[PDB]
Amino acid sequence: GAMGSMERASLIQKAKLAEQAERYEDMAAFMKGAVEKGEELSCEERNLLSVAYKNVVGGQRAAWRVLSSIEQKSNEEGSEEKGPEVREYREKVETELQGVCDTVLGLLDSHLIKEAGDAESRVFYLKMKGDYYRYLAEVATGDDKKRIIDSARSAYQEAMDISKKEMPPTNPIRLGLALNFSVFHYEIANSPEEAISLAKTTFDEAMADLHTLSEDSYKDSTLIMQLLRDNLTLWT
């Protein structure tokens, strides 16, 4: 314990071990420690950070959705007895999910976004900011919801502006950003027209330059393009 005094290299190694053990909470904690050593993350290290927190929040999102479904089914049945327990437990899971999101957004703000040099890392972190505000938006209900949505949009838009100026249309991070922003439009901001238009434009511009795409990024970029297509089919 006490990650501040731990070697950065040891924290990275332990994150890789945690990944292999499928211990994603540990993995996230190690990567948080690595970030707090104060040096920039490489592409590989950004992947470790991303995988760790995505798996943690992914499990929480799945659980929240199950509980929210049960809660609404209970409520609509309108029975005089059942409902309070599932509400309370949904609230518990929700609070934990919000805590993980706040931790990630905290790291992005305090350590990662400002201090990023190149466009690739800046776009990556701004995308991640968009994503974790989007996850907060999925469970938000108040007037805080509107503010959360605006924070997601603003993060994504800034990322988009940089990626268009600095990165090729087939770049995996640019593509991943565009995919997730289109999902934001469709699922969060109730803007299906913008979702479809962004996804369609992203797909076409990527396909137009596909012959230039390096073999090292080919798998990742074509996967994202397939998901753009899958979403477009779902949305139309």
């Binding site: 995919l179 289109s182 998901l227």
Partner: peptide
Amino acid sequence: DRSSSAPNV
């Protein structure tokens, strides 16, 4: 049926 976002690489 939910939209697909970016997966883990």
